[PDB]
């Protein structure tokens, strides 16, 4: 991380820090968004859960700095691609199945019709054998 970027991060951090003790208030997610990076509600909620302990006037810059290192605009997500393969595989199938994907889809409020779940799986299956392991999802993420 260049000194220029870290200075910009602290600049915004202080701009949103009303405590004056190098601790933002509510405006932690706002520093996040203003700093170019635009996290989704889920990403933000998750980050707040990370700083749920204390926070709101106890969020130090290093704390926010560690948070953004975990996800510098989500440039490096490989560490959590295998994690999501494990999560998606709720029954630990070991391969991508339509039922668990459809479950995940419905859990996101997306009620994909089997027809769509099907295209999804068909595209996910490189060899089209009905089973999609870590490698196929990793190839999709590289595409």
């Amino acid at each position: 991380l260049t000194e220029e970027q870290i200075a910009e991060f602290k600049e915004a951090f202080s701009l949103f820090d009303k405590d004056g003790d190098g601790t933002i208030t509510k405006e932690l997610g706002t520093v996040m968004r203003s700093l170019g990076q635009n996290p989704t509600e889920a990403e933000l909620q998750d980050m707040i859960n990370e700083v749920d302990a204390d926070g709101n006037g106890t969020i130090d810059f290093p704390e926010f700095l560690t948070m953004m290192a975990r996800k510098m605009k989500d440039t490096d997500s490989e560490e959590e691609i295998r994690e999501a393969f494990r999560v998606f595989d709720k029954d630990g199938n070991g391969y991508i199945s339509a039922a668990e994907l459809r479950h995940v889809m419905t859990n996101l409020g997306e009620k994909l019709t089997d027809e769509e779940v099907d295209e999804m799986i068909r595209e996910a299956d490189i060899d089209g054998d009905g089973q999609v392991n870590y490698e196929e999802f990793v190839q999709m993420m590289t595409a």
């Binding site: 706002t30 968004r33 203003s34």
Partner: protein, 55 residues
């Protein structure tokens, strides 16, 4: 002003450098007013609405 009534969005815009921009536009406005005064003395009435609003 209605959209930024919360200090949340005021601070967000401040992070984007809105105050420098507003002050820069305020600065331009006063220079334009001096140019107008050096030009014919036209008694405009909304003269300063932009300046007052930026301030």
């Amino acid at each position: 002003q209605k959209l930024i009534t919360s200090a949340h969005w005021k601070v967000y815009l401040a992070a984007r450098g809105v105050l420098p921009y507003v002050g820069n536009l305020i600065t331009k406005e006063i220079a334009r007013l001096l140019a107008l005064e050096e030009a014919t003395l036209s008694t405009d009435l909304q003269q300063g609405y932009a300046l007052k609003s930026l301030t």
